[PDB]
Short mmCIF file of C-alpha atoms and ligand atoms in Angstrom, two decimals:
data_model
loop_
_atom_site.label_atom_id
_atom_site.label_comp_id
_atom_site.label_asym_id
_atom_site.label_seq_id
_atom_site.Cartn_x
_atom_site.Cartn_y
_atom_site.Cartn_z
CA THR A 259 114.08 -94.17 -54.26
CA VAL A 260 114.78 -91.44 -51.71
CA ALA A 261 112.17 -91.29 -48.90
CA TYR A 262 112.13 -88.36 -46.57
CA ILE A 263 111.03 -89.28 -43.06
CA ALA A 264 110.14 -86.96 -40.22
CA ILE A 265 111.03 -88.12 -36.69
CA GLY A 266 109.51 -86.77 -33.51
CA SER A 267 109.58 -87.56 -29.77
CA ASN A 268 108.88 -85.77 -26.55
CA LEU A 269 109.94 -88.21 -23.97
CA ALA A 270 111.45 -85.87 -21.30
CA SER A 271 114.84 -87.13 -22.55
CA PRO A 272 114.31 -88.16 -26.24
CA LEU A 273 117.94 -88.33 -27.48
CA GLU A 274 118.28 -92.08 -26.88
CA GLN A 275 114.93 -92.86 -28.39
CA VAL A 276 115.76 -90.87 -31.54
CA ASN A 277 119.18 -92.43 -31.85
CA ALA A 278 117.56 -95.91 -31.49
CA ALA A 279 114.94 -95.05 -34.13
CA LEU A 280 117.72 -93.94 -36.42
CA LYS A 281 119.65 -97.09 -35.94
CA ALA A 282 116.43 -99.07 -36.73
CA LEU A 283 115.78 -97.07 -39.86
CA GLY A 284 119.34 -97.81 -41.05
CA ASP A 285 118.67 -101.48 -40.43
CA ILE A 286 115.52 -101.66 -42.60
CA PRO A 287 116.06 -104.22 -45.43
CA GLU A 288 117.16 -102.91 -48.83
CA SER A 289 117.56 -99.35 -47.35
CA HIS A 290 120.17 -97.05 -46.02
CA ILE A 291 120.47 -93.57 -44.54
CA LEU A 292 121.77 -90.88 -46.84
CA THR A 293 121.41 -87.84 -44.58
CA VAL A 294 120.17 -86.83 -41.18
CA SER A 295 119.26 -83.29 -40.25
CA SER A 296 120.21 -81.55 -37.08
CA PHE A 297 118.21 -82.31 -34.02
CA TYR A 298 115.73 -79.51 -33.29
CA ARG A 299 113.91 -78.63 -30.02
CA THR A 300 110.39 -77.48 -30.78
CA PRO A 301 107.53 -76.36 -28.54
CA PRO A 302 104.56 -78.76 -28.36
CA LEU A 303 101.95 -78.43 -31.07
CA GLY A 304 99.18 -79.22 -28.54
CA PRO A 305 98.80 -78.61 -24.78
CA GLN A 306 101.78 -76.48 -23.71
CA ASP A 307 102.20 -78.63 -20.57
CA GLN A 308 104.21 -81.62 -21.90
CA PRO A 309 107.86 -81.68 -22.76
CA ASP A 310 109.45 -80.01 -25.80
CA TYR A 311 109.77 -82.24 -28.82
CA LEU A 312 112.97 -83.36 -30.58
CA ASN A 313 112.31 -83.18 -34.33
CA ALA A 314 114.51 -84.22 -37.24
CA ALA A 315 114.37 -85.40 -40.74
CA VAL A 316 116.12 -88.24 -42.50
CA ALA A 317 116.72 -89.02 -46.16
CA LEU A 318 116.53 -92.76 -46.54
CA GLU A 319 117.50 -94.47 -49.81
CA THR A 320 115.37 -97.56 -50.33
CA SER A 321 114.19 -100.24 -52.80
CA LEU A 322 111.10 -101.00 -50.77
CA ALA A 323 107.59 -100.20 -51.97
CA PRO A 324 105.94 -97.31 -50.07
CA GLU A 325 103.55 -99.44 -48.10
CA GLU A 326 106.50 -101.81 -47.24
CA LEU A 327 108.44 -98.84 -45.83
CA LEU A 328 105.38 -97.83 -43.85
CA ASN A 329 105.21 -101.38 -42.49
CA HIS A 330 108.78 -100.93 -41.22
CA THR A 331 108.22 -97.51 -39.74
CA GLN A 332 105.20 -98.69 -37.90
CA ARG A 333 107.08 -101.73 -36.70
CA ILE A 334 109.83 -99.45 -35.30
CA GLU A 335 107.24 -97.22 -33.58
CA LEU A 336 105.70 -100.24 -31.87
CA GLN A 337 109.04 -101.66 -30.82
CA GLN A 338 110.34 -98.38 -29.25
CA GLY A 339 106.98 -96.63 -28.53
CA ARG A 340 104.03 -96.60 -26.16
CA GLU A 341 98.36 -89.46 -27.02
CA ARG A 342 96.34 -87.51 -29.58
CA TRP A 343 98.00 -84.10 -28.83
CA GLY A 344 100.96 -85.83 -27.18
CA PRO A 345 103.07 -86.82 -25.44
CA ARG A 346 104.65 -89.05 -28.17
CA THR A 347 107.25 -91.63 -27.47
CA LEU A 348 108.27 -91.92 -31.15
CA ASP A 349 106.57 -90.81 -34.36
CA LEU A 350 107.87 -91.67 -37.87
CA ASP A 351 106.11 -89.88 -40.63
CA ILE A 352 106.78 -90.41 -44.36
CA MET A 353 106.95 -86.96 -45.86
CA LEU A 354 107.91 -87.84 -49.34
CA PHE A 355 108.47 -91.04 -51.22
CA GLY A 356 110.58 -90.15 -54.24
CA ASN A 357 108.26 -88.23 -56.56
CA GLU A 358 105.33 -90.56 -55.83
CA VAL A 359 101.81 -89.42 -55.08
CA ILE A 360 99.89 -91.80 -52.79
CA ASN A 361 96.41 -91.45 -51.51
CA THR A 362 95.27 -94.71 -49.87
CA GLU A 363 93.60 -95.75 -46.64
CA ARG A 364 97.01 -96.36 -45.07
CA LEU A 365 99.23 -93.79 -46.76
CA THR A 366 99.04 -90.14 -47.93
CA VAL A 367 102.17 -88.92 -49.62
CA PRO A 368 103.17 -86.17 -49.66
CA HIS A 369 102.37 -86.16 -45.99
CA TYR A 370 98.91 -84.70 -45.48
CA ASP A 371 99.78 -81.90 -43.03
CA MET A 372 103.57 -81.25 -43.50
CA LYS A 373 102.81 -77.99 -45.37
CA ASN A 374 101.47 -76.55 -42.12
CA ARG A 375 104.29 -77.71 -39.77
CA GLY A 376 107.52 -75.80 -39.54
CA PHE A 377 108.92 -78.55 -37.35
CA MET A 378 108.69 -80.83 -40.37
CA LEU A 379 109.58 -78.40 -43.11
CA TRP A 380 112.63 -76.66 -41.59
CA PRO A 381 114.57 -79.88 -40.88
CA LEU A 382 113.75 -81.14 -44.34
CA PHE A 383 114.91 -77.83 -45.89
CA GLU A 384 118.24 -78.34 -44.07
CA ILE A 385 119.00 -81.68 -45.85
CA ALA A 386 117.14 -80.93 -49.07
CA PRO A 387 116.85 -77.15 -49.75
CA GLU A 388 116.18 -77.62 -53.47
CA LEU A 389 113.29 -80.15 -52.98
CA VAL A 390 110.35 -79.93 -55.41
CA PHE A 391 107.11 -81.72 -54.55
CA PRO A 392 105.39 -84.00 -57.08
CA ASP A 393 102.94 -81.19 -57.89
CA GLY A 394 105.81 -78.72 -58.67
CA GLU A 395 105.57 -76.71 -55.40
CA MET A 396 109.05 -75.96 -54.00
CA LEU A 397 109.87 -76.52 -50.33
CA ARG A 398 111.82 -73.28 -50.33
CA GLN A 399 108.74 -71.50 -51.68
CA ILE A 400 106.53 -72.86 -48.97
CA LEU A 401 108.86 -71.66 -46.25
CA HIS A 402 109.13 -68.24 -47.99
CA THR A 403 105.33 -67.97 -48.40
CA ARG A 404 104.49 -68.96 -44.82
CA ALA A 405 107.45 -67.52 -42.88
CA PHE A 406 107.36 -70.28 -40.23
CA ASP A 407 109.64 -69.47 -37.29
CA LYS A 408 113.05 -71.02 -37.58
CA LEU A 409 113.92 -73.74 -35.15
CA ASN A 410 116.31 -73.95 -32.30
CA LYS A 411 118.70 -76.82 -32.23
CA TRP A 412 118.42 -79.43 -29.48
C1 J1B B 602 101.19 -84.10 -30.99
C2 J1B B 602 101.80 -83.53 -32.22
C3 J1B B 602 100.65 -82.94 -33.12
N1 J1B B 602 102.61 -82.36 -31.82
C4 J1B B 602 103.97 -82.21 -32.17
N2 J1B B 602 104.56 -81.03 -31.83
C5 J1B B 602 105.86 -80.93 -32.16
N3 J1B B 602 106.48 -79.82 -31.83
N4 J1B B 602 106.58 -81.91 -32.88
C6 J1B B 602 105.94 -83.06 -33.29
O1 J1B B 602 106.73 -83.86 -33.90
C7 J1B B 602 104.56 -83.19 -32.90
N5 J1B B 602 103.91 -84.35 -33.26
C8 J1B B 602 102.66 -84.48 -33.01
C9 J1B B 602 102.05 -85.77 -33.45
N6 J1B B 602 102.61 -86.19 -34.69
C10 J1B B 602 102.17 -87.58 -35.09
C11 J1B B 602 102.18 -87.66 -36.61
N7 J1B B 602 101.96 -89.02 -37.26
C12 J1B B 602 100.53 -89.22 -37.39
C13 J1B B 602 100.37 -90.18 -38.58
C14 J1B B 602 100.94 -91.51 -38.25
S1 J1B B 602 99.74 -92.40 -37.17
C15 J1B B 602 98.11 -92.47 -37.94
C16 J1B B 602 97.98 -93.10 -39.26
O2 J1B B 602 98.46 -92.29 -40.27
C17 J1B B 602 98.60 -93.14 -41.43
N8 J1B B 602 99.42 -92.43 -42.36
C18 J1B B 602 98.96 -91.82 -43.58
N9 J1B B 602 99.96 -91.17 -44.25
C19 J1B B 602 101.09 -91.45 -43.47
C20 J1B B 602 102.38 -91.02 -43.71
N10 J1B B 602 102.65 -90.26 -44.81
N11 J1B B 602 103.30 -91.35 -42.82
C21 J1B B 602 102.97 -92.13 -41.72
N12 J1B B 602 101.73 -92.60 -41.39
C22 J1B B 602 100.77 -92.24 -42.36
C23 J1B B 602 99.12 -94.48 -40.86
O3 J1B B 602 98.50 -95.52 -41.59
C24 J1B B 602 98.79 -94.39 -39.41
O4 J1B B 602 97.97 -95.51 -39.02
C25 J1B B 602 102.32 -91.45 -37.55
C26 J1B B 602 102.62 -90.20 -36.70
#
């Protein structure tokens, strides 16, 4: 299954944190990285007085169950992390899990607010411009409907 994962961090200098998170993702059992987007520098969604965020997206091929992947992404956040409107040491958000639809206590997939976040959508569109959501919406169509500002690269 191909899972799309959003990565964010606004440690003053988040490159090393993001690279470490990516290595950890690639080390998850029964999983490997297919593609990584460019690194993007985005203004805080929240109080404008914290550092800019580094946002990216990753396509991860995996045989894990969705909640098993979430267990690994949560583990990685704890191991490299340390709030509400930021700053954020490391966030890993499951955007899509193949074509699955999940609405549990622990997991909402597709991700419950990605439709409203250009810093999630634009990096995904880079690595998966043809993506269709489980409900038949097209990523390209969402960006075209909303006209979110394009992102600057890190
Ligand atoms: C401060 C803010 C709004 N401003 C930002 N400004 C820019 N520019 N860039 C950013 O990047 C950016 N980020 C954020 C904060 N994003 C945290 C998103 N995230 C919340 C959900 C979970 S943290 C709470 C809970 O969400 C549950 N969850 C439900 N669905 C999912 C799912 N699909 N993926 C993961 N967790 C799931 C999970 O059980 C967890 O306990 C992990 C992290």
